[PDB]
């Protein structure tokens, strides 16, 4: 019997700072135990300072990104070139996903950008459109490896102030773009070590008020 | 999930946890399971995250259209029935929802309706919904009186979620409290179980099963 779904592997990661946000993802694409491509990007600039990635089944991922990019285009046509805010994009993506509730897009979606106060924003979705804004989210095959590391290093979970008898928590603070990229690179090298579907290359898209910048780093190719 | 809402002398208390799970994987500890429909109406979420979130925000839009058309805030009965009739149309298609529509109007007073995805709609004073509902019932039922003060009622709702958060593996994160009066709903904060458990243990002397 024909199975309309597949698994293209890979993993993605979004972190938000005070005046910026990053959305990273490895460039490997797989089926079963074979590599399809060592460089097939899945993090995209969708316009209006919104970056997006839909990781899982690549065909569904591409279809969704394609439809959202198109949604941004028609938002301009219908509402006098108004900028689509990250919160409005998030709600729009929910309806794209839930529209196929009974034949779902097999993807974990993450978008990143700046909110209307200029502060960094990351939104994450389940396959059928449930969404939530967070400081931090990892998605895809190695999400279970990376996410707990992010809880510990971004949100300072389980970390207390030394000498305070485990009474005072380590205070929350925004991270610099330099510190965030360090965590992204370490997260992906760790995930590459212990997950077979993750490797080859890392592509990070950084979003500030000035625009979208890209950075690329090599990952292990085994 | 564990969600509850109960009626009492001073209105309605609504309390929920904040955990989302995909099998045994803890997906989120910060989910908003109460939706603020209007200043006098609340909705609780249990079951499918997307199903609940999507259709309860849709419900909010239907309630807004009612007050535009009828120049009057929708009743709790009518609001709950819009949702129950909606899910009944989808019966068998596989929607998963356990919701509670809580609010105040002049004609009804404080009112709670239980609505679920197989079409059940029930008016009642006390309900607990979710995988940890039984744990919440155990504490809530054994301490409930109609004559509870606003202060005590808030604590009991908080304490009942904490009980379920502790025992139910698929409940946890933090407690979100709400109080519904004749003047509308009032938010009573987000309470992390990480700190709340130890604070309650020490001050109350309960949770003796746990290594102190």
């Amino acid at each position: 019997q024909f199975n309309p779904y597949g698994d293209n592997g890979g993993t993605i990661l979004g972190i938000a700072g005070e005046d910026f946000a990053v959305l990273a993802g490895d460039t490997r694409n797989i089926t079963d135990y074979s590599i399809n491509s060592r460089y097939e990007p899945k993090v995209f600039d969708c316009g209006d300072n919104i970056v997006m990635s839909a990781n899982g089944f690549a065909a569904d991922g591409d279809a969704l990104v394609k439809r959202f990019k198109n949604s941004v285009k028609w938002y301009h046509f219908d509402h006098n070139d108004k900028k689509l805010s990250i919160n409005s994009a998030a709600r729009n993506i929910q309806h794209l996903l839930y529209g196929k509730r009974f034949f779902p897009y097999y993807v974990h979606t993450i978008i990143a950008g700046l909110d209307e106060d200029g502060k960094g924003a990351v939104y994450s979705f389940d396959p059928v459109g449930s969404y939530e804004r967070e400081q931090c989210r990892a998605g895809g095959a190695a999400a279970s490896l990376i996410m707990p590391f992010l809880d510990n290093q971004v949100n300072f979970k389980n970390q207390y102030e030394p000498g305070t008898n485990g009474k005072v928590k380590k205070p929350l603070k925004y991270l610099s773009v330099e510190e965030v990229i360090k965590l992204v690179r370490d997260s992906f090298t760790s995930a590459t070590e212990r997950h077979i579907q993750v490797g080859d290359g890392l592509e990070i898209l950084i979003v500030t008020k000035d625009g979208v910048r890209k950075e690329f780093y090599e990952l292990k190719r085994d | 999930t564990t969600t509850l809402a109960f009626r009492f002398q001073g209105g309605i208390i609504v309390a929920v946890d904040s955990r989302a799970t995909a099998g045994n994987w803890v997906a989120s500890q910060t989910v908003k399971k109460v939706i603020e429909i209007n200043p006098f109406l609340l909705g609780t979420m249990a079951g499918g995250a997307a199903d609940c979130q999507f259709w309860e925000t849709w419900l909010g839009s239907q309630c807004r259209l009612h007050e535009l058309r009828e120049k009057e805030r929708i009743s709790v009965a009518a609001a709950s029935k819009i949702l129950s009739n909606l899910v009944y149309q989808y019966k068998g298609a596989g929607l998963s929802m356990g919701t509670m529509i809580c609010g105040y109007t002049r004609k009804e007073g404080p009112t709670i309706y239980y609505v679920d995805s197989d079409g059940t709609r029930l008016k009642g004073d006390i309900f607990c919904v979710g995988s940890g509902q039984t744990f919440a019932y155990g504490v809530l039922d054994s301490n409930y009186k109609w004559d509870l003060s606003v202060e005590d009622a808030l604590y009991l709702g908080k304490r009942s979620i904490l009980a379920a958060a502790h025992r139910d593996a698929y409940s946890g994160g933090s407690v979100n409290l709400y109080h519904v009066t004749e003047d509308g709903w009032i938010y009573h904060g987000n309470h992390d179980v990480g700190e709340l458990f130890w604070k309650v243990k020490e001050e109350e002397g309960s949770f003796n099963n746990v290594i102190g």
Binding site: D126 | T21, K33, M45, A49, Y170
Partner: peptide, 4 residues
């Protein structure tokens, strides 16, 4: 997809 997650449940609650």
């Amino acid at each position: 997809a997650p449940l609650x």
